[PDB]
Amino acid sequence: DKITVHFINRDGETLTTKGKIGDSLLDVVVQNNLDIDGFGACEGTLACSTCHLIFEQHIFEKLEAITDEENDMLDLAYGLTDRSRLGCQICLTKAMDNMTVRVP
Numbered sequence: 209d210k211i212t213v214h215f216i217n218r219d220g221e222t223l224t225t226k227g228k229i230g231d232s233l234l235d236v237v238v239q240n241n242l243d244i245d246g247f248g249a250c251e252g253t254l255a256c257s258t259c260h261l262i263f264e265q266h267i268f269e270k271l272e273a274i275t276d277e278e279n280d281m282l283d284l285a286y287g288l289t290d291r292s293r294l295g296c297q298i299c300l301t302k303a304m305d306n307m308t309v310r311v312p
């Protein structure tokens with residue numbers, strides 16, 4: 209199944225695209241060639257902070273439990289919020305249809 213995801217880019221523009229249930233948010237950016245500068249540098253291997261996304265609170269609270277490995281890297285991210293995750297760790301579910309995520 210596919211869902212719609214909106215990305216607010218760091219230039220304030222919204223990029224709307226579709227992703228498949230089970231794909232990571234990095235897969236969504238890559239597969240759809242979204243023009244988000246520098247996003248996903250390390251290719252989803254927890255060796256960068258560049259796939260950092262800011263979530264809506266209601267989505268964030270139902271995401272999978274964060275690992276220490278993700279958290280340690282995420283701690284170093286520019287514009288870290290209490291609703292932040294590394295996007296390459298987050299896989300799409302139907303709860304996320306029409307959600308908005310933001311790139312700081």
Ligand code: FES
Nearest residue numbers: 250252254259296
């Ligand atoms: S793409 Fe590097 S940790 Fe997510």
